[PDB]
Amino acid sequence: KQITQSVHDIEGLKQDFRLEVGDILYRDVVTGDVAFFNRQPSLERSSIGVHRIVVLENPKISTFQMNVSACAWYNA
């Protein structure tokens, strides 16, 4: 809240009902967002790259999934 210069958790904003211009909203990552993807050791220039996020909605998956041809960037 720029008007208060404070950060509010989302449980206590029932009275807000709206956001004012100048507010900063911290929203969940969605498909299409850019993410930095890095393998250690970061030896080459391609060791850190930006990928378009594809959020996997299956709660049973906890890995980072990438195309196999992408592994040549990270030597992974």
Binding site: R39, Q40, P41, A76
Partner: protein, 48 residues
């Protein structure tokens, strides 16, 4: 001669290697000192 009261406790640990007394200044060729890789991701160094 027969006393052990101030026996040097270092000589109690019998030598394990040959040149234990030689201070060597060459760095260990297997250390990860100059490789800034995290401990958990040390599996990324594994072969295949």
């Amino acid at each position: 001669g027969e006393d052990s009261s101030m026996d040097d406790i270092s000589a109690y640990s019998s030598p394990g290697l040959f040149g234990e007394d030689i201070i060597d200044r060459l760095d260990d060729p297997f250390s990860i000192e100059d490789v800034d890789i995290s401990l958990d991701v040390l599996d990324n160094l594994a072969p295949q």
